[PDB]
């Protein structure tokens, strides 16, 4: 019921149901996240910006609240949002 | 005597006596926190905001000092404060 | 030649030589830091503020540069400085 | 195909090809980074500033975007920049 998301070495753990909330997104679509699944470690791996992920995951956990970590530039965080396809 | 608290993959460790300080809180109440306890991993697990937790734990360690992390929005942090029943 | 310092669950790793640079401090003095040694895990455990520690450790690594993390309140960081006895 | 980079206990993971992009840098030069490789743990280790590395690694992942973390002083980050040889 729980999933491990490895962002450049930083492991985040959440429930499937938390992600499955927004099925249109990369993480919420089994078809899309599959492409980042690592069978060797049974986790998803993204070679991307780490500080941005706290906010991406919180978007799901909070049921829709998307905020930019004051410590991550707007342009950088915007590219992350597009990548995770939250829009 | 060591307590392990897993916030979305981020591991925190403190002493039982540290949490015991405030028994009327979710973490200070063994009855309340047990609902998040994972016997097979010997840790409590919360599918919640990660940056907010440094301040939640500092509250107990400092003996009552509640500070909001400049990098966590007032409303987001206020939600966490409520959930952990610090009031 | 390496030592693990566990700050409330957050593991930091450094060389003995790095700490030794300042023998007058808590971590630089074998007799002082020994009180926090955890045999069962082969690491030194401190039930304290996590964000402050990045700067405490860097003070040794940099050979004497003490900077406050913009994200840690001055009064809070000051107390940490006293506890680690950097003065 | 994946490399582990231990920065004072904080583990980062990325793809060799990500680092290979800039062969003239310390991390991109297999001759320069070898000095920090720990054969035993199969990771590179640097006893350095932790907060600066998100930006150092991001430099590679972004294809050349070098941004200073708002929470890390200009002089400190410039020093890390010189060490990793990104200039």
UniProtKB/Swiss-Prot annotation, chains A, B, C, D:
Processing after translation: Phosphorylated on tyrosine residues; phosphorylation increases in response to ischemia. Phosphorylated on tyrosine residues by activated PTK2B/PYK2. Phosphorylation on tyrosine residues suppresses ion channel activity. Phosphorylated on tyrosine residues in response to CHRM1 activation; this abolishes interaction with CTTN. This is probably due to endocytosis of the phosphorylated channel subunits. Phosphorylated on serine residues in response to increased cAMP levels; phosphorylation is apparently not catalyzed by PKA. N-glycosylated, with complex, sialylated N-glycans.
Impact reported for residue 43 to A: No effect on channel opening
Effect ascribed to mutating residue 12 to A: Alters voltage-sensitive channel opening
Variant or mutagenesis effect after changing residue 8 to A: No effect on channel opening
Domain of life: Eukaryota
Impact reported for residue 58 to A: No effect on channel opening
Residue ranges, annotated region (Tetramerization domain): 1-87
Annotated effect of mutating residue 54 to A: Alters voltage-sensitive channel opening
Impact after mutating residue 45 to W: Alters voltage-sensitive channel opening
Effect in UniProt of substituting residue 2 to L: No effect on channel opening
Outcome recorded upon mutating residue 9 to A: Loss of channel activity
Resulting phenotype, residue 57 to A: No effect on channel opening
Note: The delay or D-type current observed in hippocampus pyramidal neurons is probably mediated by potassium channels containing KCNA2 plus KCNA1 or other family members. It is activated at about -50 mV, i.e. below the action potential threshold, and is characterized by slow inactivation, extremely slow recovery from inactivation, sensitivity to dendrotoxin (DTX) and to 4-aminopyridine (4-AP).
Domain-level remarks: The cytoplasmic N-terminus is important for tetramerization. Interactions between the different subunits modulate the gating characteristics. Besides, the cytoplasmic N-terminal domain mediates interaction with RHOA and thus is required for RHOA-mediated endocytosis. The transmembrane segment S4 functions as a voltage-sensor and is characterized by a series of positively charged amino acids at every third position. Channel opening and closing is effected by a conformation change that affects the position and orientation of the voltage-sensor paddle formed by S3 and S4 within the membrane. A transmembrane electric field that is positive inside would push the positively charged S4 segment outwards, thereby opening the pore, while a field that is negative inside would pull the S4 segment inwards and close the pore.
Family assignment from sequence similarity: Belongs to the potassium channel family. A (Shaker) (TC 1.A.1.2) subfamily. Kv1.2/KCNA2 sub-subfamily.
Protein name from the UniProt record: Potassium voltage-gated channel subfamily A member 2
Organism this protein belongs to: Rattus norvegicus
Span covered, complete protein: 33 to 119 of 499
């Amino acid at each position: 019921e729980r999933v491990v998301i490895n962002i450049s070495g930083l492991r985040f753990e959440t429930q499937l149901k938390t992600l499955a909330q927004f099925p249109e997104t990369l993480l919420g679509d089994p078809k899309k996240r599959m492409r980042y699944f690592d069978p060797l470690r049974n986790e998803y791996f993204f070679d991307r910006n780490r500080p941005s992920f706290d906010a991406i995951l919180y978007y799901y956990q909070s049921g829709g609240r998307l905020r930019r970590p004051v410590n991550v530039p707007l342009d950088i965080f915007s590219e992350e949002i597009r990548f995770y396809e939250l829009g």
